[PDB]
Amino acid sequence: KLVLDLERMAHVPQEKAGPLQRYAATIQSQRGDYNGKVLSIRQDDLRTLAVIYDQSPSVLTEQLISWGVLDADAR
Ligand SMILES: Nc1nc2c(ncn2[C@@H]2O[C@@H]3COP(=O)(O)O[C@H]4[C@@H](O)[C@H](n5cnc6c(=O)[nH]c(N)nc65)O[C@@H]4COP(=O)(O)O[C@H]3[C@H]2O)c(=O)[nH]1
Ligand SMILES: Nc1nc2c(ncn2[C@@H]2O[C@@H]3COP(=O)(O)O[C@H]4[C@@H](O)[C@H](n5cnc6c(=O)[nH]c(N)nc65)O[C@@H]4COP(=O)(O)O[C@H]3[C@H]2O)c(=O)[nH]1
């Protein structure tokens, strides 16, 4: 399970924040979960985020865990 902590997402360094924040906003909106504090995403979404961020998926996963946005279990 890939679960994003939206509160922590507000504290990702501003240089990296935009794309992830829009991607989460859009999924949350499409689901109609406007009041949610956390957001599960598809495995395919993590691979898409790796492309957007030009990172190895392992690196991006570890980054998102270090920022507290993904849980350790995401590994
Ligand atoms: N529990 C569960 N239900 C699933 C899953 N996949 C699809 N569904 C259900 O099937 C719906 C239609 O899926 P969709 O055509 O992909 O249409 C989806 C999709 O295009 C997009 N969306 C929603 N959530 C995500 C997401 O986490 N990631 C991505 N990439 N797109 C999403 O917004 C649409 C509307 O989402 P919903 O209103 O939630 O409506 C979803 C949802 O009720 C799943 O892996 N698990
Ligand atoms: N083709 C297809 N596959 C399905 C469907 N439902 C579930 N799966 C598969 O089963 C996995 C787990 O579903 P989940 O526990 O609901 O766990 C899902 C779920 O909580 C949520 N999710 C993903 N997409 C949607 C969505 O469109 N709507 C909603 N409400 N939740 C979603 O994100 C989690 C992870 O998504 P995935 O990595 O894709 O991982 C999904 C996906 O591979 C479906 O209707 N169609």
Short mmCIF file of C-alpha atoms and ligand atoms in Angstrom, two decimals, residues 27 30-31 40-42 45, ligand 1:
data_model
loop_
_atom_site.label_atom_id
_atom_site.label_comp_id
_atom_site.label_asym_id
_atom_site.label_seq_id
_atom_site.Cartn_x
_atom_site.Cartn_y
_atom_site.Cartn_z
CA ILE A 27 -6.69 12.02 -7.65
CA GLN A 30 -11.55 12.70 -9.05
CA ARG A 31 -12.51 10.38 -6.20
CA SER A 40 -3.72 5.83 -1.33
CA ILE A 41 -2.36 5.84 -4.92
CA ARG A 42 -1.82 3.24 -7.66
CA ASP A 45 1.16 6.32 -10.15
N1 LIG B 1 -11.09 0.39 -4.30
C1 LIG B 1 -10.67 0.64 -5.68
N2 LIG B 1 -11.57 1.16 -6.55
C2 LIG B 1 -11.15 1.37 -7.81
C3 LIG B 1 -9.79 1.07 -8.25
N3 LIG B 1 -9.76 1.41 -9.53
C4 LIG B 1 -10.84 1.89 -9.92
N4 LIG B 1 -11.75 1.89 -8.94
C5 LIG B 1 -13.18 2.34 -8.93
O1 LIG B 1 -13.57 2.36 -10.28
C6 LIG B 1 -13.75 3.69 -10.58
C7 LIG B 1 -13.52 4.07 -12.01
O2 LIG B 1 -12.16 3.89 -12.16
P1 LIG B 1 -11.52 4.72 -13.35
O3 LIG B 1 -12.17 4.52 -14.67
O4 LIG B 1 -10.08 4.34 -13.39
O5 LIG B 1 -11.69 6.25 -13.14
C8 LIG B 1 -10.92 6.80 -12.07
C9 LIG B 1 -9.56 7.29 -12.44
O6 LIG B 1 -9.51 7.75 -13.72
C10 LIG B 1 -9.30 8.43 -11.48
N5 LIG B 1 -8.68 8.03 -10.23
C11 LIG B 1 -9.18 7.82 -9.05
N6 LIG B 1 -8.29 7.50 -8.25
C12 LIG B 1 -7.08 7.36 -8.78
C13 LIG B 1 -5.77 7.03 -8.42
O7 LIG B 1 -5.42 6.67 -7.21
N7 LIG B 1 -4.80 7.09 -9.34
C14 LIG B 1 -5.06 7.40 -10.64
N8 LIG B 1 -3.98 7.42 -11.60
N9 LIG B 1 -6.29 7.74 -11.08
C15 LIG B 1 -7.29 7.71 -10.15
O8 LIG B 1 -10.50 9.06 -11.20
C16 LIG B 1 -11.48 8.08 -11.58
C17 LIG B 1 -12.71 8.15 -10.74
O9 LIG B 1 -12.30 7.49 -9.57
P2 LIG B 1 -13.48 6.96 -8.65
O10 LIG B 1 -14.55 8.03 -8.47
O11 LIG B 1 -12.87 6.50 -7.36
O12 LIG B 1 -14.11 5.69 -9.30
C18 LIG B 1 -13.33 4.54 -9.46
C19 LIG B 1 -13.47 3.64 -8.37
O13 LIG B 1 -14.82 3.55 -7.83
C20 LIG B 1 -8.95 0.51 -7.31
O14 LIG B 1 -7.67 0.16 -7.59
N10 LIG B 1 -9.39 0.28 -6.05
#
